[PDB]
């Protein structure tokens, strides 16, 4: 199953549902007892996250899913300085 993530400027990012569960914020929107139709929600609009940041975030999902149990060389995650601060805002707003 795939879920859909809309950025602040309207860009649509479709990632695997299992990967999007990395974010703590996204997890509470997509999983739970089902009282609020979380297990039937497959689309999330982020007014808070621009597209160039949300694109980095979605890579981070697929990056954390592969190199999580492999004790092989964990590859460096490129974070350009211009995006550096802005990406921490999205990561704090999402993770945990």
């Amino acid at each position: 199953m795939y879920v859909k993530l809309i950025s602040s400027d309207g860009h649509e990012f479709i990632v695997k549902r299992e990967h999007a569960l990395t974010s703590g914020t996204i997890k509470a929107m997509l999983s739970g007892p089902g009282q609020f139709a979380e297990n039937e929600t497959n689309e999330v609009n982020f007014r808070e996250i621009p597209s160039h940041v949300l694109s980095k975030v979605c890579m981070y999902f697929t990056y954390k899913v592969r190199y999580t149990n492999s004790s092989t060389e964990i590859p460096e995650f490129p974070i350009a300085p211009e995006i550096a601060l802005e990406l921490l805002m999205a990561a704090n707003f999402l993770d945990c």
Binding site: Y63, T68, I79, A91, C96
Partner: peptide, 12 residues
């Protein structure tokens, strides 16, 4: 592999 909050602040 660290949380994206760490990687972002460490790159910062």
């Amino acid at each position: 592999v660290g949380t994206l909050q760490y990687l972002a602040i460490q790159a910062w």
